[PDB]
Every structure is written in C-alpha cells, then in structure tokens.
Amino acid sequence: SGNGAQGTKFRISLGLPVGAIMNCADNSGARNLYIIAVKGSGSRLNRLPAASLGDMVMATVKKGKPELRKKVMPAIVVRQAKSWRRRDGVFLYFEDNAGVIANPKGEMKGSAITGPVGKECADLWPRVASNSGVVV
Amino acid sequence: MKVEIDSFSGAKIYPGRGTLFVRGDSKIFRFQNSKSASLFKQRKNPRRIAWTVLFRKHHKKGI
Amino acid sequence: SHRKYEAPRHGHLGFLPRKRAASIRARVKAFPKDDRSKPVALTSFLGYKAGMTTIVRDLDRPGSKFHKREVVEAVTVVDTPPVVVVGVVGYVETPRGLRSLTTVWAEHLSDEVKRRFYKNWYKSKKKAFTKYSAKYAQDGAGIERELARIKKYASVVRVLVHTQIRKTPLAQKKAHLAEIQLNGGSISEKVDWAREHFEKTVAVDSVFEQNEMIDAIAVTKGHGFEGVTHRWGTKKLPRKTHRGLRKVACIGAWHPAHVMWSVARAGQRGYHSRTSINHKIYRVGKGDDEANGATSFDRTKKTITPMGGFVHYGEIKNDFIMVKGCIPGNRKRIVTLRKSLYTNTSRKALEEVSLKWIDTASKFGKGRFQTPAEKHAFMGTLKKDL
Amino acid sequence: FNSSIGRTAQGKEFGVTKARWPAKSVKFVQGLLQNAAANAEAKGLDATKLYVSHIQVNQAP
RNA sequence: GCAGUCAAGCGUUCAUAGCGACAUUGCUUUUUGAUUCUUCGAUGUCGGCUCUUCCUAUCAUACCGAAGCAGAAUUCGGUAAGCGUUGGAUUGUUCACCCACUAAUAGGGAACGUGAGCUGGGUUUAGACCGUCGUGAGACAGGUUAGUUUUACCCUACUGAUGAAUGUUACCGCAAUAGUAAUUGAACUUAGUACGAGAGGAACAGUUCAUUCGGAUAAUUGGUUUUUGCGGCUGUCUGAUCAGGCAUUGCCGCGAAGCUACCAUCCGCUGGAUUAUGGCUGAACGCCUCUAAGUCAGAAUCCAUGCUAGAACGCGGUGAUUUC
RNA sequence: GUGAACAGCCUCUAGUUGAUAGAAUAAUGUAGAUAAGGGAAGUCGGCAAAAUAGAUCCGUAACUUCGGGAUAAGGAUUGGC
Hints:
Chain A: GO terms for molecular function: large ribosomal subunit rRNA binding; structural constituent of ribosome. Chain A: Its main location: cytoplasm. This is part of a larger assembly, with chains A, B, C and D. Chain A is largely without helices or strands. Helix content of chain A is about 5%, strand content about 10%. Chain A has helices spanning about 120-125, 125-130; strands at about 20-25, 30-35, 60, 75, 100. A 3-stranded antiparallel beta sheet of chain A has the order 1-2-3, with no helix packed on it. Chain A has a two-stranded antiparallel ribbon with strand order 4-5. The radius of gyration of chain A is 14 Å and the shape is globular. By secondary structure, chain C is mainly beta. Chain C contains 5 helices and 13 strands. The N and C termini of chain C lie far apart (about 75 Å). Chain D is mostly helical. Chain D has one helix at about 25-40. The radius of gyration of chain D is 16 Å and the shape is elongated. Classes of the chains: A little secondary structure, B little secondary structure, C mainly beta, D mainly alpha. Chains A and B meet through loops of A and strand 1 of B. Chain C binds 2 RNA strands through strand 2, strand 3, strand 6 and helix 4.
C-alpha cells in the first residue's frame, strides 16, 4: 500500500502505534525518533495507526544535533521487539527498537548502521541491504 | 524435522516450538519452550540448575 | 444529529438469527450438481472431530517469494470409522418441495441402530423393525415392488447411513444417522449400487482421495449467555461510566419508538450450525494398519497418535482424513464432509502437496518428544523400570 | 399464581412447565386429610373407595 | 443553501468546453428571522463518548459520455447510497484552523437522535474576585474559580429460552417465508512501451501480497492462574525436625487443562435479468435515425446458487403400537 | 513476638462462632487483581490505577527575609551462617 513498497511485506504482527519514542541505530546524530504515522494503514474510529517493520514512517526526531529537530523527515524501522511469527516456523523478537532516517524514498541519509537487522527488511529495501551489518 | 539443538538447555524441539531470541550483540539464541525463556531473561545461570543437560555434563550423571 | 464519525457495522447481517441450533448433527443443507455422465459415487460423509495438530510442508507456489521453503501449519485430522449403509430413500418432484416418498431397509439392522429409535433402552422390549423384518421370507416381492416404486418415480435419491460407533473410543455407544445423496447417473444404477451395498461396509477410499478439497459444515461449540461485548465483539466504554461498562448505550432514536433489530444485544453465542468453505485434504491413510505417521522425508516408524493419547479424546486406530486449517466444532462432534460446490481453479487449491513431516508430539503437556522409545533413548535410564 | 416463578423440570408430568415444592402447606394438607380419614371410620366405610371431592381455601383475617 | 430557462461578454478569433454581466423562475428547511397553535398541577435544554437506520444535493470505488483531453494529472456531467469516510495539537465547543495518513478524508436526517446510558467542561442558581455604571441595595446576553445527576420488578418492543392441544411416541426430512456481505490498495511483469518534439508516462488479462470488516479454531507464541499443581521465602503458631494451619486468594518463580487475541492461525463462492451507456434492424419524416415493434452487450444495482433460522395454525415418508 | 511503636500481622489469659439458608458458576454488576508490545496518543483535565517507600553511606543547584530550600534532584548496600 505504501509509496515505495517494492515487493510486499507479509502479515507481521504490528505493535508500534503513533507516539512511541523509539531510538535510532544510525550515525546521522539524531538519537531518538518520534513515530507519527504509517504509509497506507487502516482507518477505523479511535484506533491508532500502528506500525510494523519495513514500511516507512514519517517520524520526526526529538533530541539530537539541533539542526535536525522541529522537522518531519521520512524514516524507516528495522527492529521491533514484539514476538511476531515468520512462515519459517521459528520467529524472532529483539530487545531494542531500531530507527533509520532515509528520506526521499528510502535511500539512507546515514552511511552506517548498528546492531542486527531483521530478515524481512532485506528484500523490501535494497539500499539497506548493500551497506548492512550482519543480518541476524 | 528440521534438526535442532537448544541453545539453553540442550533439549530437542522440532520447529514450530520455542522463542528464537536475539540481542544487541547480534548473537542468535533459540530456546526450547516457554519454560526456558522467562526462566532465563531474569538473569539466571545455566551451570547451576538441575534439569538442564549442562548441569549433568558438569557433575557427570548419566554418560 | 448525524453519526459525526462514520464507521462500519458490528456483526454480520447474514448470520442472524443465531439461536441454539435445531440438530446436534449439522444439517446438510446443500448438495452439488448431479453428473449423469460420470458413474455412481458417494458425496457427503459423517465424521468425528478428533485431532488438531501441526504439520510442516514444502511450499509449492512457483513465482512467489517463499518458494521451496518450510511452513508450520495446523492440520485438523478428522478420524472416522468406516461407515455402514442401512438403506436408501428417494424424494420425488413437485412444485412444493422435495417430498419424501418411500424408504427401504436392510434385513438385520445391528444393535447399534435400534437404540437410536428407542429413547429409553433398558426398559425397552426392543421390538424395532421386527414386524418389518418378516417381509424377506417370501419370493422377493417384499422389496422389489417398492424398489419398482422408487425406480418408476422419484427423480432424486438419497442413501441413509450410520457410523460404526464400536471402533471409535467414546462413551456414546449410540450411532448417529443422516442422509447423503448420490452424485451418479442413470437412476436405475443409482439404486442398483445401493442394491448390493446393503448392510456391508464402505470406507473413505470410495470417494475421498488425495488433494480432493472439501468444505466442512459442523456444529460450533457454545459457552452460554455471554454478554454483548463478546457476542457481537462490540466496544467497551470509558472507565468513568456509572451503571455498567460491558453494554451499549444508544440503541435507537425516538422515532421509531422501538428498538431496531440490528442493534448489538446480549444473548446466545455458539452452538449454531456454522459452515466453513474451501479446506484441503493432505493425505488419507488406511484403517487396519500400523505405523502410518511416517512419510517420505521422515522415515521414522511411528503412529499418528500423539504421545500417550490425545487431549480429552483418546486414541486413533482407524483410517482418517487430514484437513488443513480449522473446522468448526470442538472435540468429539459430528462434523460432515461435503464435496466441492464448484470446480475451483483458484491457483491455490489443486496444487500438489507433499508432506515433508507430520508431528506426533506430547499434546497434553508442553510436549517434548515424538516417538516414545526416543524419550527413553534420550534421557537414558530412570530409577524405575524404564 | 405463577408469574415470575422459577420453572423447573417436573411440570411436564402434568401439562404446564411451572412448579414448586411447598412445604408448610403440604405439612398441613396431608396433616388434615388423615383427620378426614379419621372421620370416615366413624361413618363405617372403606379407605380405598374414597376420593376427596371438594377442597376449599380462602382468605382469613 | 441548492438548481434552472435568457445571453451582451470572457475564453488567441468561437457565447455556451468551462464561466457568466443586467434581469428572471423555483426547490429544501441542514441556519437565522417573523408568528404564539401545543404543554407553567414540569416533555430533563449545550457539547463530547457509545450505537443502529435513512436521504443524496456524490468525496472515493463500478460502469459510460463531454473538453481549448496526445498521455499523466485533472475538470464537467449520467445510473447508482451497495459499500467506505480517519489519527492528532488548541478551545467547553457546533461550526473554527492547522500537522499527518490515505481510495478519499462528502453534505445531512431520525423531539436541533441519544442524561431511568454516562460524562457535567459550558449554562441560570445559592460562594468568591475584578473592570464599568450608581449615593446605595445592586445590574451587566462582561472575564475567571469550586459546585449531590434519583427508580424498571409493570406493559409493549427486542435477544435468547421453553411449552398444553393434534390418535401416542420416536426418527428421517422437504421448503412457506425472513435476513444476507465481503470491500479497497500496493508491488513485479505488462514497460520505460503506447502516447509523446522533448520533458514525462498509463492501462485489460497474469503472478504475489496487503488494508477495513465478518465467520470459525487453540496445534503453535503470548495473555490469564484458587488446579493453591510443584518449588522457595517473610512474620507467627504446633516443646524441636518432618509435616503443616494463620495473612481476605500471604508474597514470589514456573506452568498443565481451560478461555480468548488481527498480540495466534485458518476461511470469506458463483449465475441470470437489468440502469446509465454504445449499437443492429427499422419507419413515421422515400435518405436520416439506439425506439416507436423487435432488439445485442453491458454496473460494486436487483433477484437467484450458496450461508443462517424453519412457520411452535405449512406438509410429507417410516417404525412400534399396552394379550394380563 | 517481628519491629521505631499503643501502627500492620499472629497467638495466650477472658468472649463469641451472633448476622435467612441449600444447589449451580450465564449475562450485567459490587469488590480485589493480572496483563505482552506501545507510554496519555483517552478525556475538559494524568480523574482513578500503577511506579517511589524503610533504615545506612555518598552527593546536592537556582533563589532567599540567610533562618531555608532539602529526604532537593540522584546513585550504592541490605539475606543466612
């Protein structure tokens, strides 16, 4: 549904609603993101737009080097930390919550990442996969 | 079967079971069931609890 | 005075009234199209909901993005004794409905059907069909002029059948009974098929085979007079509210000065006769056999019974039907098995399944092992014998 | 007098599905009809060819 | 507020693609007036939360027509209300105005729906402060602050539950009818093609998934824990140990069965007749023409196959029918 | 007795077992709880609920009428033998 979902995400159990202070895993400097919306999500009375992996968000930053603040930049999430389920039978869950700013389409503004990366954000975004770390 | 050995208690589970777990050092874990998960993440130690196999590699019962 | 935030509608307008169902069987309410060209077979079935277990599987969706991979998925193995025919009965045509015309019966109905008609048993004299079982003595005009009655007239024909409750371990000892139609052709050889399957046994191999998709229509389980937030799935209130939280608080307006029938209200959940569609049969074994829990890529000699036994059910020593997904109704029901209502080529059914491995773990507790000698072969020896 | 009464099973013996088991009235009715049997023996007759023919209850002060 | 006939004009020269001067005819009460008919021996009056139904004066989706439409983007209409129509900061807000998501964030009605459903922030109470006006008591549609929301067991309506009468009773049933439900998007390929001078840049089938709702299920993860199942601990009590009471269910660790979660999984089918619309044949009107006779295809429309109750006054088939 | 204690918890000496009871575990309730992942996004308003507590050691700002703020904020130890 999202503007740039090259391929498809699968039914991954979504557990990041709007207004979660998730920290980042980048070298841009802005350490925490403030998640705000989901590209192409559901619309029902009094339910929050909840996020999952892969699909980008419009998350602003909250504290960092203060030329990034007070602005809304498209971001992308890599690590969720909620017990989802793959089709492979086994299934992850992390302990942090990743955040990467990548903000015309999903080409990364930073030049490095930190920590592991979920399997599902590999095929859906090619640009992360070229300069990734160890992928799980 | 996809053949599997536990990373906490040495017990066999054939997939569809157990919470595979990761952490910020990119070290993959996988557990046997729910019983080994919450009995781990409150910072216990495997080398001093009886029902695991690694206790019985250490005092050598049943080899 | 409009809605001011416009939302979808709770519940479904094509499942109500949802009252406690008439029969305890599911009512088989629909039948396929009869094919006159293709020969005589049998269409629906009668079964006992026993197992509901994982299975793993090679995916065969070429072009997709999990091609040649493994997937855990719940199989619902519905076990069955081989059914035994007791007679046939054929409806006739009129502009008012499928009116029933005549029945014919076998000559020695067993002791597992004569307790269906008599509601009490021990006080009963057990006189069932005995003035009907005096008709077989003469030259053959006992049946055949009523066979001539069902031959000469009566377009559509059924066959009524009871399951052997003997070889399936539950405490009823009292067989159920239903009807199932005949999908063949040439209405003579329709009943001439049942002219020699009287009182004998027909197993699942006669129609049910590999990759032959079915739908199940069953009787779901109930929990009573459950409230409105769980019946229609509707919304709670804020905590602040006096006089109840698990209710709804605007039924209808002033005029109409009644309640609308569409409003979510409390009452009965479950014990309906609901109906799923488009399941999948993975594999069918055979009855008088041991060690059919094995497959191609496993090779481990083992039975399909999960270790020790089932949960609330027991054992399985019969021929059986894998069914993908979930079928309605809990353990120990009367689920029937209807054929395809329509020839489906949805590019998701009719693709060939090859079971890599089926599981037989310890379903009661948090299960640990699959074959029972392996648990001895893993932890070694114990203080007891074994 | 059977509106809002708790209906039980054993009413289908007699025809309608509402029934209770009164105690302080069945202590007296069969307590008094043995005194009816105590009167017929002063009238010199059987105890098997009888039937209670006319019951009567009413409001009291 | 919405919609028409009329047409000097704009629109590169062309009134009507779109808009429309000066006039002119109406329609709905979604606002405000005017009137005081109905209640002053009392209709619980603002707004918000919960939730059904309806009208289209259509925002999106289906299917078509027109353009100063080459595509893409758009505007203008035609049938249609079946389906959707939000998350937020500020205000008590109706309307107000901004950030963000989207196929879009359309307009309303149902005693200005909804207080024996809530909330009581606004309001007109009784407390208090302040500015203005008065000699004062006080006024102010001026500002701010704290301020009890009562009863259903009656009738009807609804949702479920039973149930006498019929020869008795037990199975097998069949349909009168009544309700009906699935809906939208993304990506790959089509394809950097058609169309384009370029700049840009589609679609139908075909694949894979996703959003909202609905129906079931408990393998699997998670939740739940009085199974007080097991284990540990604090204080006290049984002369100590074991074994246990006593903490409103002592606390803590795990967890069986059970129940449920778009926080878990599976499933949600086709056929006909049609609207707009585009035609064939064909006159009246020798040619002309979708219509007047016939007519062919056609929508998310309607009705059927399907799904659900099965009339306790719709009915059938088949048993067994009290030796005394 | 634990403890700081006349607090909370448990028992002895004295007093009662007095409140209409029996069967079942549906809704809605009254009370008491628990909840993963998000942390106020709900509402007029963090209203209710949750965290925090006890002692012991260290460290502690703006401001001031120098008396206070101040246990400011914030870390660390706690058993049995």
